[model samples]
Target: MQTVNEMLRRAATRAPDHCALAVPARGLRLTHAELRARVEAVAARLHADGLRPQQRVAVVAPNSADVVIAILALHRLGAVPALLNPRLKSAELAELIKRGEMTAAVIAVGRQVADAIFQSGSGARIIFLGDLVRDGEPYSYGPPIEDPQREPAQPAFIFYTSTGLPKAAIIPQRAAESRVLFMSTQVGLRHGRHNVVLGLMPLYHVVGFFAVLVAALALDGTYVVVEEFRPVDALQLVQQEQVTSLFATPTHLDALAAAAAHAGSSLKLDSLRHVTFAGATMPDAVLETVHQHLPGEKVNIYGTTEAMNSLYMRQPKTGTEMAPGFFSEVRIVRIGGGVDEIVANGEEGELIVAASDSAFVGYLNQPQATAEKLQDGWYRTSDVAVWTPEGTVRILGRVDDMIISGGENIHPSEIERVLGTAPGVTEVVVIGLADQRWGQSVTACVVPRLGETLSADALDTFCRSSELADFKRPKRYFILDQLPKNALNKVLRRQLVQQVSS
Candidate 1:
């Protein structure tokens, strides 16, 4: 029944002098004691500003120490924080705020967000973040206005997913509680220790908000928040702060490796001990480059915003095989079925997870979608996976990413895996393009390494020599300088499709 704030309170008490938050580029640092005091002061001020218990407030700001403090303060007041990506357009932002029915918003001062909130026509209280935080007297209220009977099942934060149309997903206190414990016990995050973690991912993503940022606080470890991901700055921070654990995407890791290599042999990242990557599959080239430059036990994590952390690939030996978390019950079931049909052993199917006491409540304001996702207390993760006889799960790809060409169902992941190891290929994306003859053509968009050139015939020969079937081979290849990706390094396949068509 412990709330997220209670975890921070315990961490502050346990390690009052430990560095809780740090931003090297901005020269910002706060120890656990100092951070707790600031959170308390901000929470008191928010409560005084008419933020009541169970009230939803929207937060639109870039990644920074102040953003972390705001979220902590909101939780302390028993209010829910709906985190929004700062890169959203004004119209998109307005729509999300209206959908969430948020009555208040705390935004970064210099950002162009005020006009959008006003345009939404929902005159929720808009407070600039800079005004709330200043060098002044702490607001001391009379007594706690929030009810103390908040249950663990109550919504803690609302996270929106980046599907075709974004939907707000609620993270309950139970999920937060379990996440903290899992990070400490399973992920080896020591409580009240010198475990400096790199937090480069934007807070809007689940890995950034819950897995890295909040888990660092719960573990009483140092969280180095980078406002934006810069390769040189990230490597410098790891060297300067002696970061022990890092949570990043494959793209970030690859860029860091390139930066380190370019800096020569003097820059050695020897302090890193644990590295975990998610958001996208780590390509073989990137993985090899990461191990070559940064020495650590690299692991791959698989989870969605709705299901939280369900499977983890711990210091993998061979392939990208994931093991279920302690609280997770993973089942492989055939796609497009309502009868709860389970797939046979070693057969590929959609992954449906049931976490004990930690499943998400539901999506906010999307009942039909929520019902379609959650059934009989089990969350349907739209991800496809294969459960081996040895109890390992190999994630194939998303069910939506399946490409049907010539009446054959093909997963882009398998093709990507083949092309990922190709020479001079830094990145590759396999997408199905509309074709007149083949119904759908398997297309490969590639990003070649610097000073390297590749041809369609060369890649075609490489894939043909590999175990990839002939039908899965790329019919068309588009070489580009870089792939289109979001903040989280997730390839925007739809955008790629549009570009290919154009």
Candidate 2:
């Protein structure tokens, strides 16, 4: 298997003029040749600094063109890139670095984390990637060592968890091949035409690194990094850079549609050919609204941090159009049971994608967690899903997110999808609230569209009419201006549940 660095090196010679990456905001552009040179430059510096292959180099920064360079540089040295979100709290970050046994780290300049890095006491050398190399910088790559054939399965990049569960390490090179295949097959890649990608997703996460940057680079496409998801800035980039593809959550698409229709704006981005969304259950109604505004091909990716339960359903269509392949090899197992209790085909159970190719190597340095999740090379995905008659998978929700009301198991995604189509509903999250009569009452927290009044009674009628069981109907409703989301735009159900409970 060709390593990721070797992959880029080959691309440099094979398709040298192919633009691998670009940061429009920085007026930067790099063809495959240029990207290879930059990676070599950085790799040389790290090598001079006593770094070696498979050594852990933690990357703690926001999404940027530089981050990608750092990643490639690590790959060239045969080192693992341990990626962490810059927004994590100090205590939280310290624990991850110590646990992951990081030897070195690159942090953003002058943040709250500087103190945490010092306090970790891991003796790991730290470098600030944001700082520029001064005049007469000491470290330099002496000469290229060996060939571009070095490859290791330990881990190329370490990805921290957003769920606050155990951290995950992103295996590099072939570790990313599943994503590479998905991108090439799902989002058709056309090279040599200055193809631009809108990076609405965060690079700190797996989807951004594996699906967005790696896939784009492998296809020789330019990436327009949107460091943060600002509605105004995002609109401007789409129109300004003519971004060809979008990798975002449903909330981002919602924001884009709203921005395009805002009171005053001539900026229109019809160049977007592929609008791909993931990380959250998309309300079909909102998807239809997006289609009304941006006429483009769309694919909805339903998966998780574990890289499990992916179903690529083409949009402007009603149901799932699963990509043809070996996705069915993943087993569905019931939660809190032995492997012998694997759910039968056509029955709903925890969506556990425990196959070798799809399995996450293991949570970062957590043996107990590694043991709990990985059983005989299979990743015990906590999602709930059912295999359809057509042999396609439908993602319901995570086991932790399931609502057990009056002995009936209710996946909030079902009701949330229904409420998503309900007129005037902008954002919705269904939570289980403790009740006297019912073991756990089904409650919904929703944010109605501006000036659009959506009553609890009317929504109940809609749910009932829609034939979503009376037990599944939300007994109570809480209204909000917006739903809470993390950096990746995944609805923060815990926070929403807490707020509604109080």
Candidate 3:
């Protein structure tokens, strides 16, 4: 009853014949009973091959049923799944593997990057996905063998921060309890067999791991995997698989909105009931078109990987606001200030959370970084946010993404939002570049809509007539074909700064 394996056993008992997993691109489907069998089969192999309780197992793979099986199997044996981005290069993979000190790795099949990492000469035993999933005998559903050394505080999942030093966040098994008790109820995620989710995001990220797969499994909901995000494929999967819920970022929403619009009769929304966005806010136009194709209620959700803290704002409100998640404690504190120094409502500051039992143990092998973020049991999120008057929080991008001009603090998201509204502007990233006078000059990286023309002067002229203040207006603008992003489509702001300023 304490382990995820036990949880799955209960699910299989409740509905053995119900669909548990689907990957449309792979043409794979599994009932709860079948999924349990596959998970156990993988667990047995890993166990026989010497993966033991409390050990960290690196799971580097694209989104697929095999990756799902591997994670579950590791959980079953009480081993941690240190999920690495499948899109990373060999050097990045090697760096994380070394830092995580993993005893074994479950590398997925068919990704060329896998081969690159496989050759990195890391000492961790590599278990190829192809061998692990296909050949093992299905595990018999006898009395489940429990992990003798498992503890609630023991690490369950490992997610690396996509920044400096790339520290691994060590999330505990008990966080699942937080998700079940709070996330399910607070986020308004559907439960039971009727709930189906599109696994469009990478499982390596927390939202995809908890909200999509883990949340779906907690409710006995079917999880449909998308190996990679192709807008047409995602739209088709929703229609074909009858997906009921979608957890996506603003970027994903925009792409899906346009794809669905252009897809014409090729896609349908007959089965959709819930649509939500996270990471960042979508443009007003994007939201409008998204609703035209999607019949579900729109919601804004905010979460941090280490904190296990989540917040949600559902339906008919400003799409960018979020109230504190159920049973989870959150606050906005002054940046570089102590944990208890709460900021005034409507003032921008760092977001932090008290995760209670679900708080992360720490970053694996990076005590200094962990100590800096996890203070007095409150996990400091580097995200800059402000509480709206209506009692919900509005994210303004990361603290690192803040721009300082003339000694005044300005957030990039506000400037980006204003610039994005101008005609021919498809994308904008505001940055603070070194300036002799201002210390940091406000700069805008603008991307024109396809086949459209725009200029820095035009954007500056538009800002003149907009809501922006005279001081916060971009001092300079750099036009780019597109903004850079990571695997989850989150803008790599730090990287953008380096690329533009360098």
Candidate 4:
């Protein structure tokens, strides 16, 4: 497979005048040829600053044209771009820098990330973006010089986890290229097609980098960058740009819909044809709302940072039944068993994927965790799912989130689905709480609609009448205004556990 820089060079030659990248909010745009030239110049500067092949270069900035240029420049020089969020705590940033052995950092102007870089004791040379891109002698812009000694499977980029997972994942060029191809076909991204992709996901996450940004580059599509996602501004841009596709988390789509509803904006979104969402199993209400308002093929994709795109459902029905990707192999293995131990078609088990080529090589500097996750050839997803006879999988919840109450295994998602349809219940999160009577009690944290009051008796009656087993019923219910979520809108059960503890 060709390197990322090689793909960009091809795109530049093919569509020199096509808009390659744009930041609407900042009024910045770059054509294919211009972007290639900018990346080459930046690569020359980094090389002069002592960036060597396989060297780790950390980049702290939000989504911007400059950030993209920096990443591509590093790629051209064969240096690994360690993408990090600027909003991370100093201590956390320092720890990651130390762990990744970053030798250099490119920070945005007026950011306080330098302290963390220095405190890590990595002795990384820090350069502000303003100085890095300042006037310098022009360098020859072309495809990256082929390195005969470079291995095709070398780490192309270091992507740190945003889901509070304990390891920084590494995506090899070969693996990333496979992912790009897989997603390109999955979303109908092709060269010579009028594919305008709205880039709302953050660059620090793998979905944004591999699925959104890289997919656009591979397809030679116009990537409309949004540094920060504002619901009103995003709506306006969609209408103005005639955005044809979007890859966003469900929370983003929710906010956009809420903003449009509040303003009564005339957002037909007629030009959009493909919409993909990840990060969490979207609430049925949110999915229905988006489908009703957006008028596109709403897809819920299932994948992780370690493994790229796997299964996705276009215009999902009531329950989960996602079709597997072309290069992905999905299996339903018995929970806590070896890979060969398979369950029946209709049985519930852990979803293990064997997308050997598309999955990441391993976690950065953490062999033990890597070994635990990537066993044999299959990567343990740690997600509980059921395989139907129709060759589709229905994800229930995280295996760790399963509640073992009264010696029975209970998946939280099943109860959440039942309670989600309950009257007055807007949101619900089921968790295992410590209890003396039962080993672990099933507790439900609910968010009621505004000015609505939900009683424990009402939820109990609802679940009892539903298909939920009596043992799986929630032992207690706590009504809160809203449940805590991470940046990607996945409910933070750890926070919910602490809420009841404190």
Pitting candidate 1 against candidate 4, the one with the higher TM-score is: 4
lDDT of 2 by residue, 1-502 (tens): 6555655566577778866776676677777787777777778777877888878877887777777777778877778888787776666776777777878887777656767877878666778775422211223456765444454455666776545554765554455667555665665655434567788788877778777776666666676776667888887888888888887777788888877776577887878788877634566666776777665677776665665335566663533334333342465676677665778787778655545454466676677777877776566667677777877777777788888888888988788888888889987888998889757888999999999998989888788889687778889889888888866466888788787766
Q: Judge candidate 3 at residue 73 and give its lDDT.
A: 86
Candidate 1 lDDT tens digits, 323-400: 887677888888877527998898778889884556668889889999989987688988778887888888888899
RMSD of 2: 3.8
Q: For model 2, state the Cα shift of residue 347 in Å.
A: 2.9
> Residue 436's C-alpha lDDT in candidate 1?
88
RMSD of each: 3.0, 3.8, 3.1, 3.1
Which regions of candidate 2 are displaced past 4 Å? Answer: 132-149, 163-166, 170-173, 190-194, 231-236, 239-242, 261-270, 316-328, 337-346, 389-391, 420-428, 435-438, 445-462, 477-502
For residues 51-98, could you state the per-residue lDDT of candidate 3 as single tens digits? 788888888888878778888888887788998877666677876886
lDDT, residue 498, candidate 2: 84
Per-residue alpha-carbon lDDT of candidate 4 for residues 229-289, written as tens digits (9 for 90 to 100): 8888887887888888888778788887677675456666788877788735677778777
As for candidate 4, its clashing pairs are none
Ranking by lDDT: 1, 4, 3, 2
Can you give the TM-score per candidate against the true fold?
Answer: 0.90, 0.86, 0.90, 0.91
Looking at model 1, residue 385 earns an lDDT score of: 82
Which is superior by TM-score, 2 or 3?
A: 3
Q: Give candidate 1 misplaced runs (Cα > 4 Å).
A: 134-147, 262-265, 317-319, 420-428, 433-439, 445-455, 476-502
